[PDB]
């Protein structure tokens, strides 16, 4: 599965980069680590 690095934008949407920045709905990604206020964290897609 590809890992995303996502953060709050400048439903809920996250600003994510792959592996160049795309906006994903929070419902379509799954945190891989604690989500952070004002910081990025890693996610995977809900399909994978």
């Amino acid at each position, epitope marked *: 599965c590809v890992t995303l690095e996502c953060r709050q934008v400048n439903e809920e949407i996250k600003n994510c980069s792959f592996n160049v920045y795309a906006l994903f709905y929070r419902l379509d990604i799954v*945190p891989l*680590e*604690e*989500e952070r*206020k*004002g910081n990025s964290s890693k996610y995977r897609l809900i399909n994978c």
Partner: antibody
Amino acid sequence: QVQLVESGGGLAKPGGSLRLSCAASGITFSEDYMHWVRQASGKGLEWVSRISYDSDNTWYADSVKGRFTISRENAKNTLYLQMDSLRAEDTAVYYCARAPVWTGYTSLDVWGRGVLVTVSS
Amino acid sequence: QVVFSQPHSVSGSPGQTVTISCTRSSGSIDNEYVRWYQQRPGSVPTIVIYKDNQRPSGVPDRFSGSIDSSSNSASLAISGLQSEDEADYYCQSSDDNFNWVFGGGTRLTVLR
């Protein structure tokens, strides 16, 4: 639902060593961050330690760093806390707690019933 | 080390609004999410508020959380106080080393 049942602990002397165990029912353990939190009688909650679902990342409160070791065994839905170099001030009820994916691993929604640890000469 | 300081005690009468503050001693309150837990007598804590101001399903809307950057504080407001709200309340965040930290806790009395 998910239920957490702590076992182990008990009485020990300063400098002694105990192991806590926590058995989790349910289906989410292998994806949950797991925490230990303790509470001395009549005192506030004190966060102790946490471990990622894949055991690769652990954190410890300054008060226990170097003396406690958190670990888990996902195939058995079990969390551990190895408590070495015990001090009287480690006396407290210790709670197993789950930080699940739905909170972004940010909050403890399910707590165990607790296990007493008493350190005394 | 960082301390999240709460009033030792708060009291209100049924139906009133009460507020519980949580003041971070060092750093910025906005560096990390604040959470709030309720611990009723003889029971384990439950989540009231996470991610600063989000309520889990089942938590009544009379609980709300807020952040005040200018005072480096977070607050839990309970409107329409009810008898079952008598509990200890703890804020929770994390520090510069990414260790989680609870506030000292507040005992809320519903005067009856």
